[PDB]
Ligand binder design. Sequence first.
Ligand code: CLA
Ligand code: CLA
Ligand code: CLA
Ligand code: CLA
Ligand SMILES: CC1=C(/C=C/C(C)=C/C=C/C(C)=C/C=C/C=C(C)/C=C/C=C(C)/C=C/C2=C(C)CCCC2(C)C)C(C)(C)CCC1
Ligand SMILES: CC1=C(C/C=C(\C)CCC[C@H](C)CCC[C@H](C)CCCC(C)C)C(=O)c2ccccc2C1=O
Ligand SMILES: CC1=C(C/C=C(\C)CCC[C@H](C)CCC[C@H](C)CCCC(C)C)C(=O)c2ccccc2C1=O
Ligand code: SF4
Ligand code: SF4
Ligand code: SF4
Lengths: 139, 739, 80, 220, 131, 30, 62
Amino acid sequence: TLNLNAPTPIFGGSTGGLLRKAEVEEFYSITWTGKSETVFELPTGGAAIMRAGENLLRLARKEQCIALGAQLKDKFKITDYKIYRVYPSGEVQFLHPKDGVFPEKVNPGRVAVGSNKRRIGQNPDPAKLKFKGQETFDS
Amino acid sequence: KIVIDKDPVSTSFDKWAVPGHFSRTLAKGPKTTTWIWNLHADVHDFDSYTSDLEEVSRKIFSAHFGHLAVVFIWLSGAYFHGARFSNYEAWLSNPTTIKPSAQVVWPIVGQEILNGDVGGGFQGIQITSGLFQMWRASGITTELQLYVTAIGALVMAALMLFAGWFHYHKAAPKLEWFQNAESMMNHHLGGLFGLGSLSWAGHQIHVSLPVNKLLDSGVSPQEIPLPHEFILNKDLIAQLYPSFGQGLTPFFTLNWNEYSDFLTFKGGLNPVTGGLWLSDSAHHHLAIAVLFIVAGHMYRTNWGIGHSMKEMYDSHKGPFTGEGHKGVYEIFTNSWHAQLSLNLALFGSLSIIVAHHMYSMPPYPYLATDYATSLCLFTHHVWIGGFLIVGAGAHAAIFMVRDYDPAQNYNNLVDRVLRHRDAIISHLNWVCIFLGFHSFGLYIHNDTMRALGRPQDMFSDAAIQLQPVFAQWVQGVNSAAAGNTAPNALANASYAFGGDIVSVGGKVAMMPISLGTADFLVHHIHAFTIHVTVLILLKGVLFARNSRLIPDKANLGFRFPCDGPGRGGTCQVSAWDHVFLGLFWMYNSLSVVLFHFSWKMQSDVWGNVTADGAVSHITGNNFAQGAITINGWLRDFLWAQASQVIQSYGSALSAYGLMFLGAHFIWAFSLMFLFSGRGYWQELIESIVWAHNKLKFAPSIQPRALSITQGRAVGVAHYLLGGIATTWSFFHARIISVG
Amino acid sequence: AHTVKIYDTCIGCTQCVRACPTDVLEMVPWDGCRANQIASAPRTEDCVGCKRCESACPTDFLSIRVYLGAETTRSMGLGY
Amino acid sequence: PGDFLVHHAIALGLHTTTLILVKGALDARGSKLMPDKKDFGYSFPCDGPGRGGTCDISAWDAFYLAVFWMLNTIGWTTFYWHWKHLGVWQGNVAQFNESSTYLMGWFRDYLWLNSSQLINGYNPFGMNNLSVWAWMFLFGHLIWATGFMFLISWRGYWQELIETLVWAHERTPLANLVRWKDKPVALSIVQARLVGLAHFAVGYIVTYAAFLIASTASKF
Amino acid sequence: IGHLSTPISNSSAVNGLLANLPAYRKGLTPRLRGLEIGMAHGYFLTGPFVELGPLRNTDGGILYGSLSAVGLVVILTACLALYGKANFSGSSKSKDATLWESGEGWSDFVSGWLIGGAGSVGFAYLLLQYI
Amino acid sequence: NLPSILVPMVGIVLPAIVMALLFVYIETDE
Amino acid sequence: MVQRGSKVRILRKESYWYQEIGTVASIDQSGIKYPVIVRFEKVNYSNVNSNNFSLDEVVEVE
Ligand code: CLA
Ligand code: CLA
Ligand code: CLA
Ligand code: CLA
Ligand SMILES: CC1=C(/C=C/C(C)=C/C=C/C(C)=C/C=C/C=C(C)/C=C/C=C(C)/C=C/C2=C(C)CCCC2(C)C)C(C)(C)CCC1
Ligand SMILES: CC1=C(C/C=C(\C)CCC[C@H](C)CCC[C@H](C)CCCC(C)C)C(=O)c2ccccc2C1=O
Ligand SMILES: CC1=C(C/C=C(\C)CCC[C@H](C)CCC[C@H](C)CCCC(C)C)C(=O)c2ccccc2C1=O
Ligand code: SF4
Ligand code: SF4
Ligand code: SF4
């Protein structure tokens, strides 16, 4: 699960973080284990210090959690980051990795969502799909 | 310590054959035509392709030598065209009537009408560079002295060009020779700034002051003895300021008061030239030397004593500000861009201080009466300085993208500004809208009150007054310091704050520039337009790495157009695009500064003086009741004073009228690139590569449209080139005709 | 939210998937060979429409296409 | 001779304006830079920074660029008609005939010359029956120039700036207390083009209408 | 932590003024706290109109300037009514349930702003034309 | 005389009414 | 039947090199759709020189 509460890193700052949207609907949390006590940039400003932990950071968007999650795998090589989205005032737990495997890797058991069985030149004319509920790109 | 590498780069022409030899990408050849524009874009960005900081720093070191060469080449042509193609000899006999001219134009299709009747027996282009008043202050009386200075600049250009080849190809310094900041601070303060003002004071005492006292008495420029004859003939230098018969024995016995005739504190303007006293400037640069020479004995070196700048940043920290300046020395000794940003900030800020201190305290003889020169010297260095301030916010942003480090900057003063950057920007956002309403809206009020028949409801001197009392008090405490708080000064710092009028010939050299409601209005326009220029550049600097919109903006770079049409649209999010937006706002900020200058001087300051003492100005003091409305800024300034740039056809002023329309053209040509986008022109080219494929000759370098970031750059270049050269042409053809 | 469609010209290079800043895409087993992989868009409700995916696709004219649609708090990229 | 040059300028305007409109229409369904353009409709922002860059690739954007060329074209038409008739109505046709063959004549004897009274509709000494047109003339210049803001500066700069304002509002007491029902966001990519062009073109016409009416009514 | 910690943040010399203003005060009802806001704002809003107006050397400058000030209060009475109809559509609940979070008394706030606003506009008219 | 009554109605009063009518219509919901 | 190294012309209308001449790099010897890899001398807007086509989109201009 989320393991809330977990120790927030030693930061103290960022005007640019987690305003009134968080308390009404849909804020995000990223949980990783930092195997050092190094300083790392945030999506808001830059520092905190990564704990030994059980580290946890509440962010505003899912964009900022992957943008921070790309930094932990690039600079510090800790690829065990686990982004989430909260309970009652939030929507859906365990956003990434959804199948337990990183999305660049293939995993059997996933389903092809949003696939089109053609090219884009084989897409019909918009005049052929005028005054209908069908979409020009959907199959 | 000096450690030098011997021959790291060979001197061959093998890489002259290959364009783009320096990077892995550009050394493959052009597949498209964007390769041509990508080639010239990042040649002098050495940090991108070379990832060795020792290698980058040698490229920067030899580049400054090559830039020092092209300034000496420009300095030789400034002196050679002063010797061969100028009326400088007849100008010294009559500096008031004869206009300063150089650049004789060749007898071809009709541009030999630009060689106008400029004075004496000469025909050329009247120059507004101040070189004639600068060489007269330097002491030059013949063109033989101007000739050797042109030769002396060319050998100095070749010496800088030889030093740039030598310090990269043959004898390149290591990285640790560049990081010795305390020795470099010691040497430039003592050697470059101290001895430079010490030895120029040596020129000003031995060369400038002897020939200029003989020019103020006015015998002849040919009867004046040569500047080396004031060194040999000690009885000749004892005839004027007779303290040279005592020698250097007043200097070494500390009896410095004997030099009180050529090292004075007169403090004002010469009544016969209208410039600063050269005895004041000789005593000036001597005190600037001793202040700068001892300042180069401040920082620590390999001899124990001195301050270390790393230990002045440690233990300069408070309870408000965390770690304080801990980490700034490791920034400034490793980041070439953070050095370039701060060096461009105060080199451009200084250039506006030069312009403000040279019209009020005119330093050169017969400079203040030449209205054709002092206005262009103001508008040059304001424009030159404001361009560098945009380069400060430019290269501060490149520091954040690639040279910033989270590990070294933890809880220091770089990090604590990055943690409240929304508090800085939104408070800067409020003060721009506050100043925009409460300065510009006081014109919109005054346009509306003047139009609706209500001149008693506007902001004027015969209306609701907004008097500049915080500036009129500074006009009072600086004009009453002669004998009170600067007691040894004979007069004030200038005649701008208050004093008498100084008249050389028939025209005002300097007079009290009185401030009123109309001066309150424009000074809050300036503070408004400056604060927006800070608002765009600081938003690009602070949000260079990330934001709420894009948190990985540093992973995309300093210079990229957008992150797509999503998130609503993220076009012009980059740190580059804030510099691109700040270039127009610098154009908007500086152009009303010079419109304030060119109208306040012509109406309230500059003009003719009759024999009784009454002053008749150029435009007739119409700044007080005219400049309070936008219509008066249009009718009585932009419409009335542009009557000499458009009626210039058929005279020597005609090329300014050609440049007037020539820059109206290129300014409008810029909006073709600014308002449009690339994907129109790429498909317009797709039909034009069709007709070149139709007749079977299409180039293998595939024709591409300009990039989004380049089309912004092509537009902002022609906007500034077309905007400033319109103001260059309007200013020049006005004050040549009226002043 | 925006709609992200994946056409049958995908060569399973994974570049698009590794370009997406909000993890909208993933590689899934293809049944046309049971050997290669095709891109998919199972989390289009988080798509901000940046189009970083398409800019990473190597195929001459895109195999993954993003058609901007109805905007939402997630799609507008708001932290507020 | 003056009439010859302008007629080719007007011709230049009619051909270039038609070019923008014809290329936009014929490439509306697709081009090499965007083969499936028809699937995105008449008006859409672009297709991202990929494939070299795709700003202004929609058919709507082509009309948008053509609105700048038509105004320029109709401007050169109306500039010509006015100056020529001005001499004709004063019975001194020589001014147009000799000055219209070079552009400085159009700048000195047409715009600057005929703006003498208009620009003096009100001044520090009084006001006449042209104060309205003089105010409108300045009014037009300001809204023309205001359009340049939306056309040169794009969405991203503004969206990030607006975010600091959202932050500032929510953290200031006595103002925090009240809230927007609609979240503030920067104008859209397409929206800005439209809003900029609308300001530009309203300003273009309002400036010329003020000048045309006042300059002719002043001397008749 | 999410919020930054400056040494001047969370200061009781500043936070004490907030908890005792008539917008955060604990004992006030919406009819009372709108009456106090209107009595302060109407008192200074007649300030700029009577010395900066289209008619200032008149019979006349104080009466017509005070007429413009109550003209703003009845405009801002409409905006406080328009903000109430929009932001409280059925008086939309929230976590805190203040006057400003969910409305629930908002019609008394807008009426109390009108009495205290137009009163203190007229009260300050008594202190300038008379007294 | 009727100009003095009507031009503050459609200049001030009537735009205040229709802006009030359009603003509640925008922010209503089902 | 198109072999490797042969010159083709592209019939795919949405391609950048439609109705243009390219040479085949390789043919995939399986049942994968679009196996014909053609390499072109001209680069597209993404600066790539290769693409996958089917047999129906290539011809045998030789
Ligand atoms: C004259 C003999 C000579 C020769 C044969 C070389 C040869 C070389 N130099 Mg060296 N160098 C020289 C003198 C020479 N240099 C001088 C005089 C300087 C001081 C400026 C340098 C400083 C220097 C640096 C810092 C670097 C080199 C590098 C190189 C290598 C590649 C450069 C290249 O191919 O672009 C050829 C470039 C040109 C043909 C353009 C010349 C530009 C001039 C200097 C200024 C032009 C400005 C001018 C005013 C134009 C403005 C616009 C105009 C309209 C007014 C090449 C081996 C590079 C290298 O070794 O990388 C590994 C490198 O980084 N040189
Ligand atoms: C961008 C290029 C540029 C160009 C083409 C010019 C052109 C000119 N300058 Mg300007 N200048 C510029 C930038 C430029 N300037 C900038 C950015 C500054 C601020 C540092 C200045 C400061 C300046 C001064 C103080 C003077 C000129 C003068 C002149 C004119 C005479 C030429 C000359 O040789 O004077 C030679 C220069 C002098 C005789 C004065 C030099 C004294 C200064 C204080 C020395 C400072 C050197 C030091 C290394 C720089 C400060 C570094 C510091 C920030 C750490 C000529 C119009 C002179 C003038 O007005 O002529 C009438 C003049 O007195 N300039
Ligand atoms: C003349 C054309 C013009 C005008 C009026 C503006 C106006 C503005 N710019 Mg823009 N800008 C322009 C051209 C213009 N710009 C161009 C061409 C560019 C491209 C480079 C930009 C790029 C740019 C950037 C990058 C930024 C600005 C910002 C601003 C705002 C600054 C703060 C301010 O003064 O608010 C007060 C508003 C005014 C002074 C406008 C005049 C208002 C009058 C006096 C009052 C209104 C009268 C009446 C009440 C109106 C309505 C009546 C009706 C409802 C009945 C201001 C709205 C900045 C910003 O947003 O900072 C917060 C900012 O960062 N602009
Ligand atoms: C298009 C419609 C319109 C009309 C008819 C007016 C009319 C007026 N305006 Mg203008 N104004 C307008 C639009 C309009 N305005 C717009 C769009 C702007 C923004 C650019 C302005 C900006 C402006 C300013 C800054 C000022 C005016 C002022 C005035 C008044 C000048 C004479 C006067 O003071 O009489 C003397 C009469 C009085 C002082 C009292 C008249 C009645 C007052 C306004 C209301 C009394 C309260 C009433 C019982 C209830 C409020 C009515 C409301 C609910 C509808 C005049 C009534 C001046 C003024 O006096 O403001 C009030 C003034 O300072 N106007
Ligand atoms: C300077 C300063 C300050 C101050 C300011 C302010 C804040 C002020 C304001 C003030 C105010 C703003 C006041 C108010 C007042 C009020 C009043 C004075 C009211 C009264 C009213 C009345 C009395 C009325 C009544 C009535 C009614 C209600 C109705 C019925 C009838 C009548 C009319 C009777 C501070 C502290 C910040 C800080 C420091 C600086
Ligand atoms: C006009 C325009 C173009 C088209 C302009 C292009 C492609 C520039 C090409 C013009 C130059 C002058 C071609 C030069 C060709 C040769 C170098 C000529 C050599 C001649 C020798 C004798 C020197 C864009 O690509 C663009 C992109 C983004 C925003 C706006 C715009 C935009 O406005
Ligand atoms: C200033 C500016 C903004 C900020 C402006 C915004 C967000 C809207 C500001 C308008 C306010 C609401 C004042 C509107 C005044 C008008 C007179 C109202 C007209 C309303 C009509 C329905 C009548 C952008 O969002 C933007 C986006 C893309 C390119 C350029 C720009 C741009 O230049
Ligand atoms: S859609 Fe494009 S990026 Fe994604 S797997 Fe297919 S070819 Fe690669
Ligand atoms: S548009 Fe952007 S967020 Fe959406 S799938 Fe493509 S790359 Fe990912
Ligand atoms: S640069 Fe082009 S693709 Fe990017 S946001 Fe602007 S219009 Fe859209």
